[PDB]
């Protein structure tokens, strides 16, 4: 229909004027009286081998010791990142994965891929009983990010534009977060564990909330798809990491951009973003085996982590900030410090 | 140590499981939904079918449950042996299969792999154009009305937009639905593709 879409674009121009009215100065206009970080040079410590195909995602444990990895062979391997042991190596049903997660209670393991099923493995239960506890069916389209907000509730992305919630005790999808137009690629739960922002393939992130189910805010300002977002650890901001080589730091309660992180030599796509412990270093994984850092207070780069030759598919820092594990398509995980 | 011996046993198990899947040949078939899939896989995630014929083991990946836009999950098949199209023969979906063939023959992830195309459902198609020709939705393009040249006209439409600056030959087979040599054609094709990469793997080509 013509009239409702005309009303929609009229109120969209109203939203654009309302966002015009507030933007007087960005972060790089008020940060101009601080000290810079300086060119850091952190090398690897544990070049960790054991994969034979390309890997896709990882997640640290809460105790900052146990690592997880998922790849295109049927492996759901849990490592110890202190002496490079392999604590578990789960053979799962579908060889194709897309994501994985480690529970905040350190007890369960979530995984999933384009088998349209997020599966929960009951880690360290009994005498070698590393088994699938539940499988979360009732979910059309491929899956891109499972994340625990508890030991009993998961929030999983979708191919059919949802960000649904799951109760593991009965397997039933309680709430569904519809409202996107493209498929949702990543999530990042808040430290409040009541809000979560999700990015998708229509250049728009959405800040949902767990209880009332309504999308409270939708952030635009990108061009291509948004691959992997990460939340800033106060509860007020998040980085985006889109496909047009532009990590953008957005905020809450003002809905506009805070900064953009791009210059002319950055060409390829971005597919993994995670902050530091305080947030001074935004760690961004690129597509030209050149996962770099970004000083996310002065909008300039401060070092690269060139130790691969393929797509750096995933990265993640610990809860105490003492490390960063970067996993790529060359079957390796380089743990930098 | 106990945990170190457990890690070494796990690494031995992973290396032993490496050789089982490092020997098979994996294939994918797009087919655009309605096709003659249900015969060539007979002979809602990833429907994996697994057959073998004369010391070659195959693992098809019939992905149909996913949505229409597929720019985000198509890079996980970069490393497949040969794409298997399943274009049905029903003129005026016919058009949506041709738009998918443009996309996979222009991107970096599939500009070195082969395409084993299949013109399908011939005995339906031979009677479907015996009375209603191809020269209604198009102009007078064929020039005649049989099943040989009009079957070859769909082949020259698909081969019109292939770049092929490397080893990217496109086999084709006007196949029926009661065929008995269909799996021999996919065996005879994939041995030729295996020879071309092994000739490339040794280097002399």
């Amino acid at each position, epitope marked *: 229909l013509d009239q409702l879409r005309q009303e929609a674009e009229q109120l969209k121009n109203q939203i654009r004027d309302a966002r015009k009215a507030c933007a007087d100065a960005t972060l790089s206009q008020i940060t101009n009286n601080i000290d810079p970080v300086g060119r850091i040079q952190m090398r690897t410590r544990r070049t960790l081998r054991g994969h034979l195909a390309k890997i896709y995602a990882m997640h640290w444990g809460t105790d900052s010791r146990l690592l997880l990895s998922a790849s295109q062979d049927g492996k759901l391997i849990i490592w110890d990142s202190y002496t490079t042991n392999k604590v578990h190596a789960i053979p799962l049903r579908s060889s194709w994965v897309m994501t994985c997660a480690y529970a905040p209670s350190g007890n369960y393991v979530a995984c999933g891929g384009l088998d349209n099923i997020c599966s929960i493995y009951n880690l360290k239960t009994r005498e070698g009983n590393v088994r699938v506890s539940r499988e979360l069916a009732g979910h059309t389209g491929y899956l891109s990010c499972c994340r625990f907000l508890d030991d009993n509730q998961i929030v999983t992305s979708s191919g059919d534009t949802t960000c649904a919630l799951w109760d593991i005790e009965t397997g039933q999808q309680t709430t569904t977060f519809t409202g996107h137009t493209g498929d949702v690629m990543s999530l990042s739960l808040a430290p409040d564990t009541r809000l979560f922002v999700s990015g998708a393939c229509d250049a728009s992130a959405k800040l949902w909330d767990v209880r009332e189910g309504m999308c409270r805010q939708t952030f635009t300002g990108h061009e*291509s798809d948004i691959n992997a977002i990460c939340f800033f650890p106060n509860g007020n901001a998040f980085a985006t990491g889109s496909d047009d080589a532009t990590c953008r730091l957005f905020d809450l309660r003002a809905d506009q951009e805070l900064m953009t992180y791009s210059h002319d030599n950055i060409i390829c796509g971005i597919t993994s973003v995670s902050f530091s412990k305080s947030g001074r270093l935004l760690l961004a994984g690129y597509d030209d085996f050149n996962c770099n850092v970004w000083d996310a207070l002065k909008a300039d780069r401060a070092g690269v982590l060139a130790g691969h030759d393929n797509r750096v598919s995933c990265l993640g820092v610990t809860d105490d900030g003492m490390a960063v594990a970067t996993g790529s398509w060359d079957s390796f995980l380089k743990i930098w410090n | 140590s106990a945990e170190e011996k457990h890690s070494r046993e796990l690494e031995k198990k992973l290396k032993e499981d490496a050789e089982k899947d490092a020997r098979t040949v994996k294939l994918l078939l797009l087919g655009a939904g309605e096709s003659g899939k249900s015969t060539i896989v007979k002979q809602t995630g990833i429907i994996e079918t697994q057959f073998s014929f004369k010391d070659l083991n195959f693992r098809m990946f019939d992905v149909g449950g996913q949505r229409d*836009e597929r720019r985000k999950w198509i890079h996980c098949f970069e490393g497949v042996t040969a794409i298997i199209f399943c274009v049905a023969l029903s003129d005026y979906r016919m058009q949506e299969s041709m738009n998918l063939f443009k996309s996979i023959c222009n*991107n970096k992830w599939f500009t070195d792999t082969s395409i084993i195309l299949f013109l399908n459902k011939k005995d339906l198609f031979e009677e479907k154009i015996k009375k209603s020709p191809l020269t209604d939705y198009y102009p007078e393009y064929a020039g005649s009305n049989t099943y040989e040249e009009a079957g070859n006209y769909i082949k020259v439409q698909f081969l019109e937009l292939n770049m092929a600056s490397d080893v990217k030959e496109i086999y084709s087979h006007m196949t029926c639905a009661t065929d008995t040599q269909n799996v021999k054609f996919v065996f005879d094709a994939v041995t030729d593709i295996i020879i071309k990469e092994n000739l490339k793997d040794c280097g002399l080509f």
Partner: nanobody, 128 residues
């Protein structure tokens, strides 16, 4: 957002030329590969034109080889298609799509339904 508005579609007797254009607003219109897609009255979407970033690589579909022309005016931020000697088998609607990844020759889902990076297009009907 990514706005792709178009103009230049009406009724035309066959053989007569018709020039239509896409004004883009929302991104940098210098480093995205661009496509022109049509959709018949009833049939599915069909890709027509495949103009690259600079202007070197230019492709066409099967039914159109030597009757449509395409040009991106970078400074005016506009894509241009022109139909010279069109046939009455084109009573379509016309969208202009942008390929998703910049700096890349990939145009993978510019023809898909419910796609996010193409405008509502114009209507091209043909008389006789």
């Amino acid at each position: 957002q990514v706005q792709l508005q178009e103009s230049g579609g009406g009724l035309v007797q066959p053989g007569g030329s018709l020039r239509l254009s896409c004004a883009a607003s929302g991104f940098t219109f210098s480093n995205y590969k661009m496509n022109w897609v049509r959709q018949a009255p009833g049939k599915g979407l069909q890709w027509v034109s495949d103009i690259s970033q600079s202007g070197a690589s230019i492709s066409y579909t099967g039914s159109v080889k030597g009757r449509f022309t395409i040009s991106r005016d970078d400074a005016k931020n506009t894509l241009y298609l022109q139909m010279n000697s069109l046939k009455p088998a084109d009573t379509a609607v016309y969208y202009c799509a942008r390929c998703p990844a910049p700096f890349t020759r990939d145009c993978f889902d510019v023809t898909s339904t419910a796609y996010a990076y193409r405008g509502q297009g114009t209507q091209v009907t043909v008389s006789s």
